Amino acid sequence: SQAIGILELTSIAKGMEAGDAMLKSANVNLLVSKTICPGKFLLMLGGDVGAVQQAIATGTSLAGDMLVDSLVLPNIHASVLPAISGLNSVDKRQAVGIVETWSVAACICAADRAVKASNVTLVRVHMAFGIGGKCYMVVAGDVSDVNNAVTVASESAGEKGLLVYRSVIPRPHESMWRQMVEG
C-alpha cells in the first residue's frame, strides 16, 4: 500500500543534497529529515513502492561512503506514514499500548503488523537515535484491541530478538496522557 524509504548519512551537507535529489527523483513525500548523534543525518520518505525504490537508489548512489544504511520497507499501511512524520489523532482513548524495539525497521514492521491485525489507532512512532537505535510506537484504542495490537507487534519484534519492552495501559493517568500521545 505505501512504502517507507530510509537513508542514514554521516554528513549533514550530503544529507541535504541527497534529500533534495531524492525528492526531485520520484513522487515521494519527505516524512523525516533531521540530524542526530554528533553530526549524522536521517531521511525517511514515503510513497508508492516504485517511487520509493527509485528515490532511495538515487540517494544511496549519491551518499557513497557517507552512507550509514538505507532500506525500503514495502507494503506498509498508509496510517503508519503520518505516525512517523507527526502524530495521528486519537479517535479513542480507553487504553494506550507501547512497544519499544531495537532499530526503526523492527519498529515500523511491528507497527504495520499491529495496524493490520487490530483496529487501534497508531498514534506515533518515535526514534531515539537513527536506523539502529531504540524506537517505540504508541497505539490507542479499546483495551481488547490494544492488547491484540501489542501482542502482534511484540511477536513481530520478538521473533528477531529486537523487542525491548511492551506495555498495555488501560485508563492512562491524566498526568501521563499527553506525554504518551504527543511525545
Next chain:
Amino acid sequence: SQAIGILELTSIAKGMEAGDAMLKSANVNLLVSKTICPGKFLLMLGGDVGAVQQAIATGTSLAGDMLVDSLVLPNIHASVLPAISGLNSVDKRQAVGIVETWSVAACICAADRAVKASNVTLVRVHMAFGIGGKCYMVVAGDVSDVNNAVTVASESAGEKGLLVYRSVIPRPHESMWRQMVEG
C-alpha cells in the same frame, strides 16, 4: 516537609508504564518525566514522604532489571519541587548564585540546604543528563543572602567531593540574565 522520588530506567516504554503506575499508587505529583541519553528515561515525583516511598517502591518493583537507580530524598523544602519541574519566579534580582554538582541527589540536597539556611529564591534546578550526571541550581536574592546560600550548598556537595563549581554574580549582565534565570 516534601519528599522527592527519583526513578531512572533503561526503557522508555517501561518508564511510561512505571510513571503511570506510580501516579496511580499514591498521592504524588509528577515533577519530571523525560527521556535522556541514547534511550534512557527519568521520573521524578514529589509529595509527602509516605506517598513518595510507596510510589518509588511500586516503580522500583515494576522496573526490574531495567532500573538504573531510584532514591527517595526525605525532608526537602517545598520550594525545591517547582524549581525541579519548572522555574520559580524571581522576587529579587540583586545577585544570582549558581552551584554545579555531580549527581542530582547532591544538587537537590545542596539546594535544600541553601533554601533552609538563607532567604534566597531557588529559581531552578537543572540536570544535564540523569541521576548521576552534571546538575546545577540557580538562586537569586540580595548579594549577602546569595553568598550565604552558595556557601552552604557548596559545603554540602563539597563534603562528598561532588562540588564542581560555585559562583556568586552580583548585578548579572543583561545579556546573561535570562539564560541564568530561565535556562
Next chain:
Amino acid sequence: SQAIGILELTSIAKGMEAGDAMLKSANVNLLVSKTICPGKFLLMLGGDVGAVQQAIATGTSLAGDMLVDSLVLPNIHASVLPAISGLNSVDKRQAVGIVETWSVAACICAADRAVKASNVTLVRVHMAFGIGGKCYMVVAGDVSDVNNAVTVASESAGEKGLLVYRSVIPRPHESMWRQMVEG
C-alpha cells in the same frame, strides 16, 4: 572588520560566570551561549578586535583548568556574526550552497572567505557540537555566485584537511528549502 571570540568550558556554572565577566569586560556582543555534550558550555562573542581579545583573555583567565579551548578570529566580515547568532535573511533564492567542515574555526574562516570572494548571502552557520565538532554554513544567491562561494570555502577548509563535504543546489526542492535556510 569584526572579530569572533570563542571560549569553551567544562563547567556550566563557570561558563555563566565567564560570560558575565566577558560581557562586562569589553564592548562585545554575545553571539552564542549554550551548553553542549554531556555538560559542556560554549560562549561566542563578537565586536572590534581589541575588545574581543580583551574579553577572551578575561574569560580564559577565569576558566583556568575548566577551559576546553579559546580562540580569537580577527577580521571576519560583519555579516558572519548574525549568521552565527541566528539566521540572516535571504535576499535571493536561486541556489543554496552548503559547506561542512571539521571545527567551527575552519567553518567561520571558510564562510568569511566565501562572503569576501562572492556576493552570496551567508544565511547561517551551524555547530553540531563545540569548537572541535562538525559545523556547516549555508549560503544563498545566484547559482554562479554560490558556485564561487562554495569553491572558495571548500578550498579554505580543504587546505587544512578539514573539509567534510560541499554541495551546490540550484533550485532547492520546496520540501527541503525551509530546513536549508532555517535549520
